[PDB]
Paper text:
Depending on the structure and the chain, the loop containing residues 44–53 is at least somewhat disordered and has a higher B-factor than most of the rest of the protein. The average B factor for the chains where the loop is mobile (in more than one conformation) is about double that of the average B factor for both the whole of the protein chain and double what is seen for the same loop (44–53) in other chains where there is a single conformation. Phe41 is found in a mobile loop that appears to occlude the active site when not occupied by the substrate.
Herein, we have described and characterized the structure and catalytic mechanism of BiuH, a cysteine hydrolase that hydrolytically deaminates biuret during cyanuric acid catabolism by R. leguminosarum bv. viciae 3841. BiuH is structurally and mechanistically different from the ‘canonical’ AtzE from Pseudomonas sp. strain ADP, which fulfils the same physiological role; i.e., it liberates a nitrogen atom from the triazine ring and allows further degradation to make all three nitrogen atoms bioavailable. The protein is a tetramer (consistent with SEC); each monomer adopts a five-stranded parallel β-sheet which is surrounded by α-helices. Helices α2, α4 and α5 (residues 95–102, 178–186, and 202–213, respectively) make symmetric interactions to another protomer in the tetramer, forming a dimer, as part of the basis of the quaternary structure.
Residue numbers in the entry:
A (entry chain C), C (entry chain A), D (entry chain D): 8 to 233
B (entry chain B): 6 to 47, 53 to 233
The structure:
């Protein structure tokens, strides 16, 4: 029994092997630091409405996938309080633009694990049974146990959502795809610091017959999810 | 006194800390392979051929000053043991099936003439070649191990395509703490707008993936 | 200018480049689950005195290295409460011998993160500025950020201590060594489920001119540490 | 549909899911450098009879597993001819004992890819369709594509053979086990530089209800292989 989600450039997953047991949702970096007042992204002066836009669509996808027993994974980008996992270049760049990782702000130390700004927003909070990946980079595979977790759960398909489209979401999709995972990006469930870069990161997926996977949207996914 | 040097770059002069030396810096030339950019293989080559002469100039300058040089080739073992099923299916669907015969041999298959690096940018002895089964040069390779034994800190990225293997390689390197410079006239893509956008993505958030420069600025300031 | 610790089969580190800035202590898995009453190792019926023996020697090494400003790393083997990072074989084997990972015991769920038995023992507890690695396997590199952290700190030399000698300690040493790190095993600062396997894991290091590194002891280290 | 091989400490694989499509033999480092006159191990003065002993048992296992269509994997430890993948400590230790990696010997440059001494021995040579892993370390996973290959082949179970028991074989088993692969070590199909270390590496597997997997022998495997 095959099932597909209408998607561009091909119906997804490629082979129609779409089941709760072999499919995970990943919700990438929906943290106050990336989409809320007083955090990292706000300190850089970007338009928060672009990264808040995906909240309600993700909420709908999350509710549907929880109700149908799909695996749910959440990521949080951040650093130990001792900053041992913070590259010096990453830190310096953030300080140069007045959004220093580990520096005090209105929601605590920016992008620092255990601080209020770093946590996942309440609207998309994890519940019992859902894996949280704490990552020190943009890619969710680099220096984490995500791959190990996917393999123990025998996950083949990944549905990607979160922020930002062109940074953590795209990097995560590229890493997953290289390792053979079959990935669907939900375009209304991501957002970026620049709308043009958001659209372009989406278009990049579709080139060469779906070089990184395929693209769909929250309504299409929720309507056809088995 | 200080050995501090910078290349003019956007959004910040690179490398961030000015620690720019032959011993801690590599050029990487990504996937300049016959099937993707050379006369015959695997219609429009113009956008992926454009970077050849700028890369040639950067390569010559960095060789002359004793910098580390690294080359990549995307490809698969001839038995296709390292080829994901989704990757294969997609390539077949668009009539460019990995491992299938084409005019320069089996497409994206190691040891085939089309898969090799173009003669204009061919490696010489002492330059490491990374053979990779994915877009990112770190995934399933020994690149990280090699960088670490050479104590490389700074990487200058060139090659094709800007938005696929180049960008992915830059993101992987960046996440691991490497300080990366993308040379915008030394890369190209299948779609010029995606090329420009992959470049712009580097610069956001004060240089989220590193910084961006060009062949002339590099050659003018390389120590 | 060069400094060496007396060690077998060669004075360590190989090149004498021994400094606080390029050297870390790692204290592996000194958790109640591995060395205390009521935990995983106790449930399997092994002799706790073998894995408690290293506590005082480690304490001495830790005090000396803290006082001289060396980087300090601690590991904890364990699993998320949802057990997503627990391989099915690992779990089955632990259940078959009556020491089931995730199953309730006198110190909480065995080898489960957040449970009392899982935490590092108070005698060797981390202080601020010391990195903790949470690992789902025996090797400290597998599915962790340890390599990322070592690289940002520019660590070249690693001094290994903890438990068990032949399992997590040896595996960690082998991983580190393969990646080019220069490793010293402190033989009186480790212990095992079997004393003979402890001795054998130590001897394995020394073969082929120090195939995994070199071997010393707490007193030799403390006496010559720069 | 379940099938088991008689093994210690438990019948293997744990769940009986033993099939040609999900099971590989790995033959580790059966190269002239490790078991032949004039190579690396011979230069260090170790007794070649210990590392030659496993050749006939491996030959039998290889023949049986080829005849039944199981996946076959081979490894070779070695270095790129420019030595870009050779750690400085690894090189220094090999030079100190008169067996310098990359230095000329009677079978070519020691442990250097493309040299006669480095190649797999004729008695156990690969045939087409059997993946060869070229590794710069002891562990077959470190800096290779082995994990990617195993995952695309959907391999779950690995049968380990080769040399040396306590170095490359044990390291590879520990890496695989940590990632959730189900591993069987064939004790008569490995050997080491020290017989006691060989026996101890085997015994280490069996502790804690099969901490690294299980242990059997060539005859038991061949008799019960489905």
């Amino acid at each position: 029994n095959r099932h597909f989600i209408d998607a561009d450039p091909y119906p997804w997953p490629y082979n129609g092997a779409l089941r709760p047991d072999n499919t995970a949702l990943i919700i990438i970096d929906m943290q106050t630091d990336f989409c809320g007042k007083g955090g990292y992204v706000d300190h850089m002066g970007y338009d928060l409405s672009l990264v808040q836009a995906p909240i309600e669509p993700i909420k709908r996808v999350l509710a549907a996938m929880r109700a149908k027993g799909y695996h749910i994974i959440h990521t949080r980008e951040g650093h130990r309080p001792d900053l041992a996992d913070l590259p010096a270049n990453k830190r310096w760049r953030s300080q140069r633009i007045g959004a220093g990782i580990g520096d005090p702000g209105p929601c605590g130390r920016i992008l620092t694990r255990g601080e209020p700004g770093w946590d996942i927003i309440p609207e998309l909070y994890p519940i019992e049974g859902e894996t949280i990946i704490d990552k020190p980079g943009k890619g969710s595979f680099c220096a984490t146990d995500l791959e190990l977790v996917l393999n123990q759960k025998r996950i083949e398909n990944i549905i990607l959502t979160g922020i930002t489209t062109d940074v953590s979401v795209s990097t995560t999709m590229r890493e997953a795809n290289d390792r053979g995972y079959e990935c669907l990006l939900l375009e209304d469930c991501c957002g970026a610091t620049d709308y043009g870069n958001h659209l372009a990161a989406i278009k990049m997926v579709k080139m060469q017959g779906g070089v990184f996977g395929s693209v769909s949207n929250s309504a299409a996914l929720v309507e056809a999810l088995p």
